[PDB]
Design an enzyme around this catalytic site. Sequence first.
Site, PDB file in Angstrom:
ATOM      1  N   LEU A  17      21.171  58.285  -0.937  1.00 52.52           N
ATOM      2  CA  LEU A  17      22.114  59.350  -0.639  1.00 52.52           C
ATOM      3  C   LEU A  17      23.535  58.930  -0.979  1.00 52.52           C
ATOM      4  O   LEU A  17      23.936  57.806  -0.701  1.00 52.52           O
ATOM      5  CB  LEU A  17      22.038  59.653   0.852  1.00 52.52           C
ATOM      6  CG  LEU A  17      22.903  60.788   1.388  1.00 52.52           C
ATOM      7  CD1 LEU A  17      22.357  62.131   0.985  1.00 52.52           C
ATOM      8  CD2 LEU A  17      23.005  60.699   2.898  1.00 52.52           C
ATOM      9  N   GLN A  88      17.272  56.361   0.706  1.00 48.49           N
ATOM     10  CA  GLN A  88      16.469  57.433   0.124  1.00 48.49           C
ATOM     11  C   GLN A  88      15.822  57.027  -1.201  1.00 48.49           C
ATOM     12  O   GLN A  88      14.784  57.568  -1.565  1.00 48.49           O
ATOM     13  CB  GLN A  88      17.319  58.698  -0.067  1.00 48.49           C
ATOM     14  CG  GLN A  88      16.506  59.926  -0.413  1.00 48.49           C
ATOM     15  CD  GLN A  88      17.328  61.178  -0.621  1.00 48.49           C
ATOM     16  OE1 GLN A  88      16.761  62.252  -0.912  1.00 48.49           O
ATOM     17  NE2 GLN A  88      18.627  61.076  -0.475  1.00 48.49           N
ATOM     18  N   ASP A 242      36.115  45.724   5.639  1.00 49.48           N
ATOM     19  CA  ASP A 242      35.050  46.598   5.166  1.00 49.48           C
ATOM     20  C   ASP A 242      34.954  47.723   6.177  1.00 49.48           C
ATOM     21  O   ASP A 242      34.433  47.515   7.265  1.00 49.48           O
ATOM     22  CB  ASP A 242      33.739  45.814   5.069  1.00 49.48           C
ATOM     23  CG  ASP A 242      32.552  46.673   4.688  1.00 49.48           C
ATOM     24  OD1 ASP A 242      32.688  47.906   4.634  1.00 49.48           O
ATOM     25  OD2 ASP A 242      31.443  46.150   4.426  1.00 49.48           O
ATOM     26  N   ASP A 288      25.384  46.438   4.037  1.00 45.76           N
ATOM     27  CA  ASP A 288      25.173  45.023   3.754  1.00 45.76           C
ATOM     28  C   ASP A 288      23.924  44.808   2.895  1.00 45.76           C
ATOM     29  O   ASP A 288      23.875  43.875   2.097  1.00 45.76           O
ATOM     30  CB  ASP A 288      24.989  44.223   5.040  1.00 45.76           C
ATOM     31  CG  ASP A 288      26.230  44.176   5.896  1.00 45.76           C
ATOM     32  OD1 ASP A 288      26.050  44.052   7.130  1.00 45.76           O
ATOM     33  OD2 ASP A 288      27.377  44.232   5.395  1.00 45.76           O
ATOM     34  N   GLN A 292      27.485  45.626   0.113  1.00 43.26           N
ATOM     35  CA  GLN A 292      28.641  46.500   0.227  1.00 43.26           C
ATOM     36  C   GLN A 292      29.322  46.350   1.591  1.00 43.26           C
ATOM     37  O   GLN A 292      28.714  45.865   2.546  1.00 43.26           O
ATOM     38  CB  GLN A 292      28.209  47.961   0.009  1.00 43.26           C
ATOM     39  CG  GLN A 292      27.767  48.270  -1.420  1.00 43.26           C
ATOM     40  CD  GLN A 292      28.905  48.429  -2.410  1.00 43.26           C
ATOM     41  OE1 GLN A 292      30.050  48.050  -2.145  1.00 43.26           O
ATOM     42  NE2 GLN A 292      28.587  48.975  -3.573  1.00 43.26           N
ATOM     43  N   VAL A 296      31.525  42.325   1.210  1.00 38.08           N
ATOM     44  CA  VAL A 296      31.934  41.911   2.545  1.00 38.08           C
ATOM     45  C   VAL A 296      30.804  42.108   3.556  1.00 38.08           C
ATOM     46  O   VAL A 296      30.225  43.193   3.652  1.00 38.08           O
ATOM     47  CB  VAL A 296      33.176  42.696   3.017  1.00 38.08           C
ATOM     48  CG1 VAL A 296      33.557  42.313   4.442  1.00 38.08           C
ATOM     49  CG2 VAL A 296      34.354  42.454   2.077  1.00 38.08           C
ATOM     50  N   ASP A 303      22.740  36.503   3.021  1.00 41.20           N
ATOM     51  CA  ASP A 303      23.240  36.875   1.703  1.00 41.20           C
ATOM     52  C   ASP A 303      22.262  37.859   1.053  1.00 41.20           C
ATOM     53  O   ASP A 303      21.168  37.462   0.680  1.00 41.20           O
ATOM     54  CB  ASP A 303      23.360  35.593   0.875  1.00 41.20           C
ATOM     55  CG  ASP A 303      23.796  35.829  -0.536  1.00 41.20           C
ATOM     56  OD1 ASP A 303      23.943  36.983  -0.967  1.00 41.20           O
ATOM     57  OD2 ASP A 303      24.010  34.855  -1.295  1.00 41.20           O
TER      58      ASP A 303
HETATM   59 CA   LIG Z   1      29.390  45.083   4.699  1.00 41.10          CA
END
Ligand SMILES: [Ca+2]
Length: 320
Positions: A17, A88, A242, A288, A292, A296, A303
Amino acid sequence: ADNYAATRYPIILVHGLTGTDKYAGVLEYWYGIQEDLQQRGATVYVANLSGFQSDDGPNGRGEQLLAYVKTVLAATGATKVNLVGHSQGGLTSRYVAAVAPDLVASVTTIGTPHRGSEFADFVQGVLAYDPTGLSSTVIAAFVNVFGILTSSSNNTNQDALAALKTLTTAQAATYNQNYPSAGLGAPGSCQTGAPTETVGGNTHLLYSWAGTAIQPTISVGGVTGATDTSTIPLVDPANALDPSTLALFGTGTVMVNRGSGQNDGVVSKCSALYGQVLSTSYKWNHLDEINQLLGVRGANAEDPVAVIRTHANRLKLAGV
Ligand SMILES: [Ca+2]
């Protein structure tokens, strides 16, 4: 550089989305991930689908992804692909595996609302409190235009109301009846299914993972409070640099107060289960999972680039 992530079949990353391969042609949805995988020997393509649509339907994201898969196969000379979908995008990937099983070697879903989202239920419910319905029309126009403007190709096929409905828990239950999967447990089970499926004689390896940064941790007078376990409490610079960190803590709080249990801000652990469940313990919010915003993450977050890279190696070792 090496061949750690070299797979037999090309990988296609499939956004969810709001998405596109690159927002405004500038910001990668899968931040830094195509680059990392390619440095490790992977052949990786990034789908660009309607950010707002159903997954089924002649104009839906599923048929868009199917068409894209065929172009990737033509370009590479490969015969199948490994689909890796976020949110999605995991539903879209299921659609293609079901309708073109001969073209798919695996389906991996990351934070995918297989059972829908309590947050979509909330937003749909909010709109019902406008007895004129005008809020739905106006906000749909706004979101559809956001989709056109941010799509890397200015894709005008945007239907925000259909996208919202698609992600509700009631509609996801219908989707699962329409597009059943051996990788899914029974409705209401909070269980996964099988690690593989064979559809029309074509075997698919099925995988998932989930982020559960947002944990319910206190209940007082019927109200549930959450903790963002991805962060050092309050002071984590991810809360500052973020904006999605605190936003997803807020939406995740709405989620737990609708009975979701642990979640990533918009998708619960239970909703995310599919195939071989590799982990539901990542201390990640929903963004994350795709590295994103701009790489951050909270101090306690794993990771995500390394997790996806290792999964490409897993696929390689499994024969796809
Ligand atoms: Ca983040």
